[PDB]
């Protein structure tokens, strides 16, 4: 803390606290991730890797104090929840699509790099004035809030894979398209009920093995019939609802990949030039791609 000026608190966690910062040299704003610590083993994914992608926050410096380790990142002034709330929870549809493509890029890179999001949610997704969406370095973990949790995990799943993150993508896509959470459950039991009311109660046909699950049988769920997603999110189009469907699959193994999610017809309007961009270049670089005023 000799070259930076620590400003207001942006957020907190059990493992770290984040502060808005400024350089005394360049005057540029930064994010100071204060890692909360005789000896402390540091496992930071931003330190044990180099997640160099246009949709992941970029690490700039490391500071050692006798009491802490501060990771200096690039700064974004609003998180997805703050952005939603600022435009009264009504995001321009073209932007929802740009935000979604961006989120799928960052995640498809993490997955490629064997990185998982243990807690994907709007507050961990950040947005700048150019319309860029990036994954904050918070809750990222090597492969070794109940709202965004998949049904299989809730019903006892030993598989902690990239597929978990895909259910969260579906949840956030809906939250962006409608301005409200898809399944805001308070208990494991209520969350499952909230899910089955939208997707339908699983049958041996839609989810093989369910009736053999001890915890599922004990909850006595009414046989709910699936409600058309397009009816729940009218601002969405046929392709938007189809991508949502393919994302919100009961079983992780059937959930579309982040790579394939990007090749879906919902994104056709964006063009072929966005698929050829290297990891490090912004999607906005293209004349064809631009943020719409809210
Ligand atoms: O710009 C930023 N670069 C980062 C690098 C790592 C962690 C956070 C941030 C960050 C943040 N920029 C902003 C802007 C508005 C609100 C929060 C916020 C940020 N981090 O807060 C995330 C905390 C997490 O616990 C979710 O609440």
Residue numbers in the entry: 162 to 198, 205 to 311, 324 to 473
Text taken from the publication that reported this structure:
The crystal structures of monomeric CDK16 represent the first structures from the PCTAIRE family of CDK kinases. The kinase domain exhibits the classical bilobal architecture intermixed with short insertions that help to define the CDK family fold. The predominantly α-helical C-lobe contains the CDK/MAPK insert, which packs against the αDE and αG helices, as well as a PCTAIRE family specific C-terminal extension that stretches behind the αI helix before folding back to terminate beside the αD helix.
Viable crystals were first obtained for a complex containing the type I inhibitor indirubin E804. The structure of this complex was solved using CDK5 as a phasing model and refined at a resolution of 2.4 Å with one CDK16 monomer in the asymmetric unit. The complex with indirubin E804 displays some disorder in the kinase N-lobe, consistent with its requirement for a cyclin partner. In particular, the partial unfolding of the αC helix in the indirubin E804 co-structure suggests that the isolated CDK16 kinase domain may be relatively unstable in the absence of a cyclin partner. The hydroxybutyloxime moiety extends across the expected ribose- and phosphate-binding sites of the ATP pocket.
